[PDB]
Amino acid sequence: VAQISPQYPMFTVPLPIPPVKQPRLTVTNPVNGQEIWYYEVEIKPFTHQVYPDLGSADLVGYDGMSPGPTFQVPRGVETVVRFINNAEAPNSVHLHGSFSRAAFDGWAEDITEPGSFKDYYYPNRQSARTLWYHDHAMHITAENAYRGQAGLYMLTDPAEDALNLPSGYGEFDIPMILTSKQYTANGNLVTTNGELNSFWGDVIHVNGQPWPFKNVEPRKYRFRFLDAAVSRSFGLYFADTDAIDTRLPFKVIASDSGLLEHPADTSLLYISMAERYEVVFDFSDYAGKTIELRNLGGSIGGIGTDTDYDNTDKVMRFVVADDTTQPDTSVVPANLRDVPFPSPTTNTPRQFRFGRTGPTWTINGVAFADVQNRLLANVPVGTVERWELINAGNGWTHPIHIHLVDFKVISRTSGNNARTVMPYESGLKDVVWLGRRETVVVEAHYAPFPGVYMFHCHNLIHEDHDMMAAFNATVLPDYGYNATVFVDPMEELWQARPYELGEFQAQSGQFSVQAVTERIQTMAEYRPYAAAD
Numbered sequence: 001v002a003q004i005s006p007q008y009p010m011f012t013v014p015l016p017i018p019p020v021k022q023p024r025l026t027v028t029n030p031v032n033g034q035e036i037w038y039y040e041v042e043i044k045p046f047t048h049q050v051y052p053d054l055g056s057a058d059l060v061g062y063d064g065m066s067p068g069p070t071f072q073v074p075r076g077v078e079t080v081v082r083f084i085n086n087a088e089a090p091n092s093v094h095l096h097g098s099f100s101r102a103a104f105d106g107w108a109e110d111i112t113e114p115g116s117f118k119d120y121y122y123p124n125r126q127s128a129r130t131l132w133y134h135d136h137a138m139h140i141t142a143e144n145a146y147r148g149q150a151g152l153y154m155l156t157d158p159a160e161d162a163l164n165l166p167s168g169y170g171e172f173d174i175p176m177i178l179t180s181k182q183y184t185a186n187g188n189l190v191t192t193n194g195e196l197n198s199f200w201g202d203v204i205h206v207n208g209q210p211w212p213f214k215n216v217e218p219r220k221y222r223f224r225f226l227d228a229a230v231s232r233s234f235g236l237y238f239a240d241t242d243a244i245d246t247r248l249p250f251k252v253i254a255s256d257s258g259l260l261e262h263p264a265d266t267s268l269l270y271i272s273m274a275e276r277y278e279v280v281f282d283f284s285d286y287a288g289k290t291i292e293l294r295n296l297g298g299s300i301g302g303i304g305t306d307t308d309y310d311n312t313d314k315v316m317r318f319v320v321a322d323d324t325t326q327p328d329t330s331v332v333p334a335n336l337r338d339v340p341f342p343s344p345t346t347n348t349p350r351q352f353r354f355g356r357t358g359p360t361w362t363i364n365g366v367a368f369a370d371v372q373n374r375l376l377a378n379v380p381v382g383t384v385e386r387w388e389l390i391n392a393g394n395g396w397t398h399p400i401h402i403h404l405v406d407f408k409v410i411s412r413t414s415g416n417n418a419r420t421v422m423p424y425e426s427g428l429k430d431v432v433w434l435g436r437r438e439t440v441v442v443e444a445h446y447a448p449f450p451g452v453y454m455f456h457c458h459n460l461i462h463e464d465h466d467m468m469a470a471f472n473a474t475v476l477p478d479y480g481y482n483a484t485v486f487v488d489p490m491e492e493l494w495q496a497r498p499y500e501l502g503e504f505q506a507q508s509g510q511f512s513v514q515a516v517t518e519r520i521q522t523m524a525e526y527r528p529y530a531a532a533d
């Protein structure tokens with residue numbers, strides 16, 4: 001299909017890298033004595049230029065940048081972020097991949113209007129993994145993310161750093177935030193408002209950059225891949241600019257929840273919205289040349305339904321250098337980690353069906369906005385449940401995300417005989433792609449925190465209208481751990497707070513180090529994430 005967005009001079013701009021995020025301070029957690037990093041993220045409108053000739057894009061991002069700044073949080077240390085809505089429409093932040101407490105996870109109605117803020121308290125207790133934070137405000141999540149509200153966040157671990165993979169953000173450890181958008185003639189974004197099926201977009205970006213280049217060295221590299229698009233799934237492969245139809249093969253080191261048990265040797269990476277895979281690519285043998293990362297056309301090989309455009313088969317270009325400026329000491333081992341799969345159950349799976357009821361995308365025929373029927377499962381905490389995710393349709397694809405949890409992919413059956421379980425789905429994830437006529441079952445231990453959590457399709461057009469539901473992690477009244485105050489995401493105690501706007505830049509009022517400090521220490525005392533120890 002012919003491109004709508006103006007013509008772009010491609011592979012002409014070097015790959016941008018989002019800066020890391022700095023905490024404002026630390027606060028002493030009175031329970032254990034440890035400290036707590038505290039960030040302050042403002043959400044403001046800003047204007048950015050993509051088409052080097054004319055026109056700027058009207059955005060709204062985390063700190064006035066899309067993608068928002070990146071978080072490298074060492075495991076163990078609890079972290080806390082204040083999100084300050086200085087924008088034009090409500091917001092609700094989700095840190096995709098953290099088993100936070102219900103009121104810190106980005107419940108779609110737990111929202112912050114402009115002229116207010118809200119503090120999120122994150123445990124940072126899980127395994128090394130790559131996470132991202134995005135808006136989750138009800139029914140406007142597509143457009144809030146489309147315009148810039150998303151970013152990186154890495155739960156790191158020095159133990160696995162003792163594997164000497166290509167290390168170091170920005171040089172051997174590079175982020176790949178894939179989006180797919182569309183622009184006006186004048187240069188501005190075209191709104192996702194009014195789309196009821198999918199917004200594919202005809203312009204491909206990495207780190208907010210349409211069709212860019214990166215010069216590299218003939219050595220192993222770590223690439224972190226994230227499909228942050230609204231509706232587009234990707235089918236990625238590498239090919240030498242001179243046999244563009246030949247797939248260069250690579251190694252997939254980690255999925256959404258972290259490393260797989262063994263590097264998945266592959267040559268084509270199926271990746272849908274919100275999925276994360278980490279790839280290492282030996283640029284060893286391609287010295288001198290110029291490798292191109294491409295996107296599988298034909299609606300991702302008949303897995304999906306995406307509309308392809310003139311230039312949505314190209315993602316970006318890699319220029320290998322003539323020589324390594326210093327040799328490749330980095331390494332990729334063959335055993336990677338022990339993966340804590342959940343102790344298998346044998347029970348019959350719970351069934352969730354993802355379709356539309358007339359014009360509305362539903363799960364088992366209910367729409368998120370339907371408060372009565374929104375809750376579709378009660379799972380007592382500590383339960384393991386297999387869940388069967390069913391896309392019976394031929395004209396829609398559905399990457400299904402479940403909050404709090406990390407699950408193992410048990411099975412996929414494709415009505416189109418298209419595929420079975422893929423080799424990089426052997427570890428742990430929190431998002432699975434239901435392709436055309438696909439049914440998947442996943443297994444996950446529902447632990448360790450009670451609370452009311454979301455699950456939904458991560459096609460933001462679908463999610464917004466209205467393919468999203470809720471499950472309740474249940475305990476008995478004798479449980480404890482203060483759970484009585486962390487199960488309701490709308491708990492009036494963790495809600496947003498108005499702020500006098502100029503007191504934010506003066507660090508007065510609620511932002512004085514002591515108010516900042518009293519509040520966090522107040523917060524810490526509740527021992528929120530203590531059930532994980």
Ligand SMILES: *[C@@H]1O[C@H](CO)[C@@H](O[C@@H]2O[C@H](CO)[C@@H](O[C@@H]3O[C@H](CO)[C@@H](O)[C@H](O)[C@@H]3O)[C@H](O)[C@H]2NC(C)=O)[C@H](O)[C@H]1NC(C)=O
Pocket residue numbers: 375450451452472473474475476477479483484485487
């Ligand atoms: C999700 O599940 C949680 C439990 O994990 C539910 O919280 C529970 O809500 C019930 C209300 O039906 C509470 O029981 C009642 O509390 C009142 C107040 O003391 C008491 O007078 C009654 O005799 C009865 O015990 C229960 O304590 C509470 N449990 C916890 C741990 O908070 C929650 O309602 C569920 N959410 C949804 C949306 O259904």
Ligand SMILES: *[C@@H]1O[C@H](CO)[C@@H](O[C@@H]2O[C@H](CO)[C@@H](O)[C@H](O)[C@H]2NC(C)=O)[C@H](O)[C@H]1NC(C)=O
Pocket residue numbers: 030031480481482524525526527530
């Ligand atoms: C449940 O929540 C309370 C609220 O913070 C936890 O902490 C104590 O709360 C009392 C007031 O209820 C304060 O006077 C104490 O100062 C708090 N403790 C500390 C060390 O400051 C309480 O510990 C929590 N219980 C569990 C089991 O997590």
Ligand SMILES: [Cu+2]
Pocket residue numbers: 094096134274401458
């Ligand atoms: Cu998400």
Ligand SMILES: [Cu+2]
Pocket residue numbers: 094095096097401402403
């Ligand atoms: Cu999520």
Ligand SMILES: [Cu+2]
Pocket residue numbers: 361396397398399457458459462463467
């Ligand atoms: Cu969907």
Ligand SMILES: [Cu+2]
Pocket residue numbers: 094136401403454455456
């Ligand atoms: Cu979600």
